[model samples]
Target chain A: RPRFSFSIAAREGKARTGTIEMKRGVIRTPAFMPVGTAATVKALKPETVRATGADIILGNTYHLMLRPGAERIAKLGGLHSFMGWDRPILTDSGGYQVMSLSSLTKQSEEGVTFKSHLDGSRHMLSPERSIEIQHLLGSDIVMAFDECTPYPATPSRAASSMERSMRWAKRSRDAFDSRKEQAENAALFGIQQGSVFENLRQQSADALAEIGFDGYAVGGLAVGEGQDEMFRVLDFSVPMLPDDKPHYLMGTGKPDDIVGAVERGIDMFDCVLPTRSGRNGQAFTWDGPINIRNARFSEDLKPLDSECHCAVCQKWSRAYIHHLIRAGEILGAMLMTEHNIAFYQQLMQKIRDSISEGRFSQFAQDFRARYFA
Target chain B: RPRFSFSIAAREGKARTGTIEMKRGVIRTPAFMPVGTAATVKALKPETVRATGADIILGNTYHLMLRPGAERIAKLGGLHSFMGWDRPILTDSGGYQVMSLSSLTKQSEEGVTFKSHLDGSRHMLSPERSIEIQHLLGSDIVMAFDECTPYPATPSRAASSMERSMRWAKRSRDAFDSRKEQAENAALFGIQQGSVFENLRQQSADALAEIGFDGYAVGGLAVGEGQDEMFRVLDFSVPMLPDDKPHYLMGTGKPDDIVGAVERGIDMFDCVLPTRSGRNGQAFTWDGPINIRNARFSEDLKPLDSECHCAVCQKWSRAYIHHLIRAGEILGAMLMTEHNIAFYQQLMQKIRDSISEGRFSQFAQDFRARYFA
Candidate 1:
């Protein structure tokens, strides 16, 4: 059997239903990979994350390399053993976070150098280094190191950024290939960066296609861009990547945003909105997001989402969750995050089913109407 | 079909192995009830708490009444349905917290009036009112309203406090009996408070025995007094309470403290140390407590406690937990609290087993030596 393979089961227009088979697990696309960030899905347990129907979880190379350190994790038998997560883990390149979170950042053609946001420790994240860190962490799906171009960029700036990312993608590929033992059981994903420029996105995609990757990511849109702008970028940028492989929209979206992305051909997604917002008292529902901290919910004896059947929804009430949030209880965050992650996974499942049934367009339309209404 | 019953299965010296059968659940002797203040056991889910072998949990009437309000909880189907814990819940009377946590306190034979520590709202909690709040919360084990006498009080002060507590205990019992429907499935416990005065303790116990209660608690010793002082008081106070009923040590704590109290004939215990300290990076182990934030554990691949088998300890490494603590992750608190609570339950299990096997004294000596070492 292959170490990794992506097979499309069915398609409705741009939306596709498929599976990505790996040694650890099989992720049914379009899959929502919960952001585990620093070895945990915020306030959730790995088992609870799995119970929420998350086939895979995303970890941050930046956070791990800084705190536990990649070398430390490798010595402790890799991220899976250390964090007790047995499922497939997709780790991002440290480049994006290095530029965003770190202090004193410097980006060049070779790689990015920055001081750690956690401890002011200086570090370098060349494409080679990022791939090395991911390998050390034993990432099942290793993302290629690429510059995440900032939004609202000029065509010239977008082109230059995309060009640098393409060059880094090739270097990332070479570095991944060099580690033959680790490479045998892992998949590498290349990220396309164009800051919303169609031509630049196309060029970056062509460059990555020539170098090759197990999967492709449409990157650089969800940074300060409105949902309309992000969707517009995804409209053209998603198709520029390979349809035969997975198309992951990095840091993409709210429930509505995800639905729109899926309609535009994206097969994979990872966002902190569900987990992060849940911690802050925001809950995602079929109708939209509701803040549990609102006074109206203090006495409202309803589940977060009436249609949801997650453990949090089934066993907890909005009033109880409201009381927890108001009192600043940690269990509130745990319950809310659990429900939100389950909601996202449920959304993905519905999306996949809709495509399989060849009624994705109608599903997308209905989802938007309710969510926006 | 008694609503509550206590039967000693075995006794080794003063240590006893028994079960307190309640309508909701059976609590083993020397059981450590996790403090679920404000409707949560800090960062843990109720199922996780149950998984840690807790037959029951203690709810703070003070925090619940101030935040969610006793009326609101009752309206939402009481504390069990509100918190999603179907097991027996022991709720403390609002008297202790009203004096300690609230401001502008006023205490008299009728009640104590104070401003809410949370929102500065004024409230009164007489014995009748405290019992009403406990009933509203649907408490399975209701603690009688009692002033937790301050330590180092003069004999006169101690006598006055104990007298007040005994008078309030009668009122609490009367109020509990008035709610015939709620009383049918619940047990009311009288709190014996006399500071460190043995004569005062005996007097208080006699007063409660005359009024009658389902259980007796030796309260007010773990307030600031060291373990030796607490143990000294328990040596005499334990025998003063009725042995036909359960002997509860309210807010009585630490592993060694509990082991010593169990040896002195205490049958039930509740404290915030395990959950509170766990949130602050302290983990309880058979070998004593260790702070996970210490640099020594940064690379330790071993579990928090090698001899234990809680879910957190069974899967997580010390290094991973260390990183999480240092990074201020909520899951760190969740994992640490889970382990600590499980450790407390395990300690209770060992204590009960030792009593049953007629080796409690030997077990206590071994535990103290290793724990104190």
Candidate 2:
């Protein structure tokens, strides 16, 4: 049976257009997977999210494990059937949450243990346990468990963190391989962890490539690093990985950042920026993001974006959406989220078309000028 | 050029199936207008609400007037255009909201003065002002301003309240008529308020009929009176209204209550029960209302309602929806609201069909047995 495979169709400059064939469905690159943090893309139904042109959505293993429990989701059918999305799903390991959400954490060779942010309950997340949980959740593309090295770490501290992550990646690979049935149907991606140092990133990438996996994710850059710093890291970090597999840049980014990352050859991404900003009444348009809650939009009869043609922009007015947001209505959050997601997917489509047509450099230059103008 | 018109197509016992013809659309009765308190039906969009087979929706003058202000809505077109719902909308006068939401209220022969619940701004809602505000809203079916008499009132107090409402109804009629341009496109409805007293109800109905109106509403029954008392009031109250005009039951009720009211010659209904209950994780079914938060539903992999054909029910299992509700995800509220609205519209369809077939009595009997069993 076919499990997961990536085939590049064309490349322009450093940008490429391709498709990742999976057991559930094919995902086109460069793909922007919307974050479904709690098995839901907040304020949006699965079908509505799908209708926004999302090929796959990202799920947080940490949130699901804490709330419904992994065993519970398995027994009641996997997350695929649970959330009503028939397309493929990619789930992040609990490493990000272990550092971000847990109450107290202690790290050792085995794993990190901490109390749940929701309750005071204690739990341990090891490489084996993380892979097992993702297996139970029936994730189509599973991420290897790793420590997200914090920003601005000393050379020694960064090296130690990267070494521990490399060790954990091997353990994750072993455990995933041991689960023969799950390994056959699901793909696992190893995460490269290092601070923004080129030598450290290259070392992490080489280590991950040697361990071998279906894909590779360049992690630990977007934590607090500004765009220039992040791109500097991506410049040296991306090319060191294997050329045949998918290269994912985790937790990135705004539209301009995605275009820049694509210009640097990163193929996949997932972020909460669009969905989160949408809930706050901020909308992303071709001319950068606009706050819909602005008083100027109170009586603006035009659609949110005159250039684009999403259903929200086609039918609803900025005034109507503005009224809903001011009233604290849920549909406001829903519509904004829909429009942002559509904007991202459409941006990716334009990027792909530019690459396929051999005009990616021009497209990137034009996009930045118009968006930031 | 045709104004609003309601004509019966079939009658069984006291149940009548009819069509309300208006410029925007046609409403088939007995119709259930979902409550859109603040120009939104909670979590569902106007298009989604329309997809649930709703012909008309109810808007609250109290909520809209306070937030967006009546003049503001008029300046930005009107409620129909502002809300993105082109279909007809029936708006209640600010009377119910003034009594329920406002503080420091004072009532007299002329009107009531109260402080706004949201910002403590004081406002007065007299008969002429109420109708004027409804006119500003461009309400398709404008309800006459009347006091919603509190339950458990003394007979003398109830008679006094009913008498005041009758006087206000006449004033509201005159004001609605004085606005010649607005009256040409919109319809005016008079409310019957007698607080469950049959004699007072008859007197109130007689007074409204003598004044004449585009439609009549049986108000004040569903406030706090139990189903038994409410039905008894409707038994005497509904028959007193003109047979040619539409009879609206205000702020009513559960599925069973709606079925019972339909069997008593009511042609239109509006309520917040279905939408509000859905937000609270309560789902109405053919059997009964089920609280999805209950432990039993955590593992039940069945749909919310086995008989339901709603998109929510068709794809999602109770287990999944239960997880969402337990996690307090907004999609849970969205899905449940969608389901409940679909269920209400479907129930109305069944009632209409039964009325058309002259078997409404049998249908109501079977419905009550299964629904309340």
Candidate 3:
């Protein structure tokens, strides 16, 4: 049976450009996956979002499983059909919400038992259930069950969590195999956890690699740790994994964070910052994050970006967008979100272009200068 | 200078199809105007909303005047440049909002003054100010100010409001003449209000015609008056108005109500029901309305309306929509809104087609039977 494949087509320093070849589609790397948190990119059609150059999307096991329930989605078809997105989908294990949203949650060797954020109903997220949810959602890339230690996590506690996560990775792999549709060909990647402890990070990766995952990920970094410290951890952790498979950096981040993470050898990423911040009236222009609600935009007749070809920039002006946002119009949110997502994808394209041209260092400097201007 | 012109192409029974040739563009009738309550059709891109066969859009003076201020929109460039809908825009006078949303308002020969709904700031919306706001918004089809009475009104109260509205119509005309851009080429329509009093309705129509409005509108019905009474009002009110000017029936209706109104010679219409109900999970189908949150659709693989060819129906299934709505996904609201708007436009097209082909009666019967089925 054919499966998804990825290869590094070009590299400059640690920066690279590549393509992810999956059965559904081929994703140009370093691609940005828009987060469809509740099976949708908010206020946007999937086709329109795709037109912004996004090749993959992230679906949360936590959100989908809590409402609508994954079992129902599977019966109807899968997450792709449910969300009207027929492209590649990468699903997270219920790890992030189990860390953030779950209340009175306690971790055991079995799993974490916690109350739901929606109705306060009690639920447990085990390795088996996490894999089950992703399988039901029909994710192209399924993450392994791992603990996401909060930033400023103590070394001993982080080590203990890392140890438990290794055991769960085995269970996740086993559960993934048990699903009928996934038994033969689905990609089951293992996640590494250890906070910022380099030894513990290496240990988690060593354990996961020994068990042999389809790919590997540098997890547990972007949880409010200052980027400097996180980058140090990533520098040590990413190299410890197998070299052949793809490397995903979970829940990462702003443009600079993505650039830094890529330099540390990470491949895949997802975030809601671009879309969310856009709807909040902030535009991530090449000149930096500018709030469209500011008075300066009231008469500004220029596009969000001069070089963009997304329908929004071509047809609308800043003044029109300003009026809509000021009037509390939903079109403001839709148009801005469309532009911001396009902005991020364009940035990704620039990064890939730089890497292929073997001038990433110079290109990155120029990018920062213009972006912060 | 030449203004926008409408030509009645054909008629069957009381229903008709026509074409509106304006400086901005040509519009097909009986066209449905998407209600842009506050400069935007909530959650939809202006272009996307435009793509759904909406050649003209209705904007509210109340919402705009409340926020961003009308003079501010004028300086920034009117609603056309401001909202990015350059085709043509029809702005209603603030009479509806002043009556519906304002607090403790009192009217006189000059106009009315009351506290703002948002901040309780005292303001006036006289005929001059109302006409000024529409001019500032650069509206194409400008509605003259009128007091909209609720249904089941006392005959005396209806008579007084109708006379007051007639006086306002004269004042609005005076203001329109004084405005610069209007005389060069702009269309102004007077609102006819008289509750259910046939003689009062006739008087209001006659007065408006004598004073001369570019077009006439039958208002003050559909406000808690059941469908039968509304149809009765149209039966007499429509014939009382001049056939040369385009006739608009304001603040109406469901599909059947619209069909009935069109059957009585109403040429233009606008309402918030389709967009509003879509967000509330109501999808209009050929067989009636379907709540996408219902359990019955959980496994059904049907489109919301099999006869429609909207992108929403082309891309999605009923089962997924049910899941999305049940889970409160924004895509559910977005797709449903798209489908509903398309349904409305499609209905308008079919009605127009029938009227042009001299088969409007048969078309209405088929539509009513199918929708009521």
For every prediction, compared with the true complex, DockQ reads: 0.86, 0.80, 0.65
Candidate 3 lDDT over residue span B65-137, tens digit each: 8876788888877888777778888899988899889998987878989778988988889989999899998
**Candidate 3 local lDDT, A99-173, one digit each (tens):** 888788987888889888889888888999899889889998899988767778899989988888899999998
Question: What digit string (tens of lDDT, one per residue) describes model 1 on residues A234-265?
Answer: 88888888889999988877888788888888
User: Considering only chain A, what is the TM-score of each predicted structure?
Assistant: 0.98, 0.99, 0.96
Q: Which pairs of residues have clashing backbones in candidate 2? A: none
- Report, for candidate 2, the interface RMSD: 1.0
lDDT of 1 by residue, B118-206 (tens): 77889998899889999999999998998768878989999998998998899899999989987888999999988998889999989
The segments of candidate 1 whose C-alpha lies over 4 angstroms from its true place after superposition are: none
After superposition, candidate 2 runs with Cα above 4 Å error: none
Lowest summed lDDT across 10 adjacent residues in model 2 chain A is found at A306-315
Off by over 4 Å in 3: A104-106, A178-180
Clashing pairs in 3: none
User: Which lDDT value does model 2 have at B110?
Assistant: 92
> How good is the docking of model 1, by CAPRI class?
high
Q: Could you estimate the TM-score for every candidate? A: 0.98, 0.98, 0.96
Give candidate 1's error at residue A219 in angstroms: 1.5
lDDT of 2 by residue, A1-373 (tens): 2798899999987778999999899999989999998889989888888887899999999999997888999998899888888899999998898899898899899998989999879988999999999999999999999987887788888888999999999999999999987889999999887797778888898889888999999988888889999999888888988888898999898898899999998999999999999989989888878999999998888888887768888878898898889889988988999999988888988998999999999999999998999
